[PDB]
Every structure is written in structure tokens, then in C-alpha cells.
Design a protein around this ligand. Sequence first.
Ligand code: NA
Ligand SMILES: [Zn+2]
Ligand SMILES: [Zn+2]
Length: 220
Amino acid sequence: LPDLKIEKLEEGVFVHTSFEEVNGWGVVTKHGLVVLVNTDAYLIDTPFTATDTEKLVNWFVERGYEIKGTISSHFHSDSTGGIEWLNSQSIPTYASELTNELLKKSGKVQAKYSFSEVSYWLVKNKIEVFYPGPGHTQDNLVVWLPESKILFGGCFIKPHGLGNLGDANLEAWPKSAKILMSKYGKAKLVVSSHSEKGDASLMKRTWEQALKGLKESKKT
Ligand code: NA
Ligand SMILES: [Zn+2]
Ligand SMILES: [Zn+2]
């Protein structure tokens, strides 16, 4: 299993990359962020495992940062796998009320703190959590960093194909993708869960893939 990677994007923004075996043939790649406000650190998604969440936290703690909070972009384990471990360390975990309902329904440990607001400022003027509407999942969120114009699109941003449709809302995805394009056109960088980082055009590529997936589902 490849090791957790940490890469600096700019001052105050790091991408964490963790890996999971799909079964014998190679691995899934998952990107999240760590955002620094002075000496406060915020996890944007957890790695898949408690073990990789602890490695990630330990890397920032050793450099004099305090983990002030985590946000999970959706209920799937690639965003939420570390919540139980973070809770055991009394590190504040956040998810939307809908995300916590979906964790509870799937027999998973919930985030300690939840919110209902469509636009939720995890950190005033620094970290915005936004619900564009259903897509990859009913609850999928994005995270916007206004000072860097970095959008973390999580598993919503799907420039090359929508992936697993098990929990997806194909009827809503195109509308949700246009809402995102319309709000975050000033984005300098779009970081997705499962693809290479890109420019604002990844939001339009997602819209196109959403339209195509909906069209194909209506044919059969
Ligand atoms: Na450092
Ligand atoms: Zn997912
Ligand atoms: Zn994912």
C-alpha cells in the first residue's frame, strides 16, 4: 500500500493523498487538504484510515500546529474514515446534518458538530463549506478558500467520468454542477478527490459529464 503523501500547494495549503486497495490489481487515490490559519490546522476530509489520519495529524503537530477542526465533504469512508480516531483525540469533527444522518444510517461514527446552513463558514472569511445540491451523493459538499481562490470539489468534481453511481443523484447532478460553476468562476485552482488538480474548467467538465450520465441513464 503506497504511503500517505503531503504536498505544499502554497502558504497555508497542503494536499494530503491516501490510498486504498480495490482488490489485488492496484489502488484508489484520494486527495484532501490541510489548511493553516496562523498555527491552527484544519483537515479538509480525512484519509481512508485511522492510521493515515494519525500520520497526517502527527506531521502537523510535530511542526507546531494545533488541529482545531476537520470537515468531511461527504459520508463515504474516503472523506470520513478518520472521524472515530479524531473523536477519540477530542479533535473537533464537523459534517453537515445530512452527512451525519447518512453516517448513522450506514452504522458509522458521526462527526461531533453538525450544521444545516447551505453556506457554512468553518473559519470566518477563510474556510467556506458549500452545498451545491445532490450529485455524487445527496450530501456532497465543496470547500472554498477565498484568500487563495482554491476550491476543494471533493468527490463532486468528476472531469473524466462520474464513477460509482450507487449513492448518486443523476437527475440533480447537472443543476448542482451549474450552481457550482456560477458561484466559483473566480476559482484559480480546483482540487478534486480522485483527479489531478486543475483550473475552474474542471467545474464545466463535471457539468458535461453529469449531463452525459443523465442522458445515458434515460436511454435505458
Ligand atoms: Na512547515
Ligand atoms: Zn464518495
Ligand atoms: Zn471519493
